[PDB]
Write a structure and sequence with these properties.
In chain A, strands 5-1-2-3-4-6 form a six-stranded mixed sheet. Chain A is built from five helices and six strands. Chain A is an alpha+beta fold.
Chain lengths: 148, 137, 148, 136
């Protein structure tokens, strides 16, 4: 008999997005499922602090994000952005999210979803068209915070 | 009387509300990190000529929309000892409570601040105001 | 008589670079002078810790970097990466560099020089072609550290 | 015997030298910052399965190039008592002195570390090892 073994490694995964017209909605493909924030509006999410992880089934609409804007400097910024208190939570369908994405780890569950949540929220917020920030463009942005 | 203003740091803008010779702003040089925590504290600093008025901007527009809104933010806005009178010194005693006054101004500053981190067009001169209004050591 | 005035503002300036084949050598244009690290090899500079600011005369070889790849996240990372202790210095030619680039500033000389150097060295290091990092590629990169 | 190795974090790699059941590395989670400050301390941590040998890499190549070099680095590498045997540990009986051994290993680990921060090709799968080997 060979020695007892417990693997620690996470699963294979890809960063991907859905076209939402004004932004790219990012998620992590693990097998036939996609971890993502439950949101139709990335600005409302950021401006209200309601960032709940959900899992949905992989479809052919998810674009594999190849040309990556995530680089060393952005990931190091985001790694150090998140303390013990953050806006990210997980619904009923995401019980295995920490094990799927991190494997066996010394990150606690809350820390794990903070780090994943920060990477997905930032990638979405930076996918948008650049426009001057003035009274006018601020007003339309503010609507995402208050319009139901 | 009460007006939105900013310190231009090129790649973004730090926003505040100018009242007399004082500026009310969130206590954070990184509004993006603040937005990820869900928490922001108000602070007050002395007005300088580095602060620029955001033109054609009326706080009244935002107060109306915010008091109508059925959406509830989960961002928590608090005040250090200095900003104790922040509501009255910014709103007098107009028909809205302190909690609503702090939430509204918090949401205005967070909204404009965060937008500047993700929407600002960058070019060859963007570095000028980044170096000109550099954060504390 | 109007009131005494002491201006606090830095000069007008543009991010520019020179084409050095395998990297972009970055500088800050102020009038007909360009502030830059005194280097013909940005990797050697980084790997030996000898980054001295020098001043050259504006030529038409300098490209005004219009599609700037410095964004909020990279800038904030670099802001928080450099402190009092760093590799950056100035030659006799750069007496007024702190005043030209920062105007009147609560940052000490050394903090100011560290921030400008960090921005220029990082823009130069990001400018190169991506290659897998293996025994072969590490060997050739190591030559920049030890070849004179 | 004594081999360059890494912990892959996808967007970058943390390099060290495996010596028996231990790894000599720079005491830093950000080699880029380290490169900017001009100083680095060595540390020793326990070998885990997460460390991968850099295949085809032989320390002898770096030693010969380094000792032949007329380049003076201004990077300052230091050891404390838990790392001060690094010389005989990594280069066994080789005749280079302690300051040369510290400078050489420091330069190797800084070079490979810094290279990985700026040259690594990124793709849709780069996140995998970033999350797999997450730090605290």
């Amino acid at each position: 008999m060979s020695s007892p073994y417990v693997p620690t490694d996470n699963r294979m995964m890809q960063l991907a997005y859905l076209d939402r017209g004004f932004y790219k909605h990012y998620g992590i493909i693990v097998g036939e499922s996609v971890y993502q924030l439950d949101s139709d509006d990335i600005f409302k999410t950021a401006l209200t602090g309601k960032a709940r992880f959900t899992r949905t089934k992989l479809t052919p609409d998810w674009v594999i994000e190849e040309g990556c804007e995530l680089d060393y400097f952005r990931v190091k910024y985001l790694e150090s952005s998140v303390n013990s208190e953050h806006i990210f939570s997980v619904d009923h369908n995401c019980e295995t999210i920490a094990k799927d994405i991190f494997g066996t780890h010394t990150l606690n569950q809350h820390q794990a979803i903070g780090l994943v949540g920060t990477i997905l929220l930032t990638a979405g917020l930076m996918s948008t068209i650049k426009t001057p920030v003035n009274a006018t463009t601020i007003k339309e942005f503010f609507n995402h915070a208050v319009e139901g």
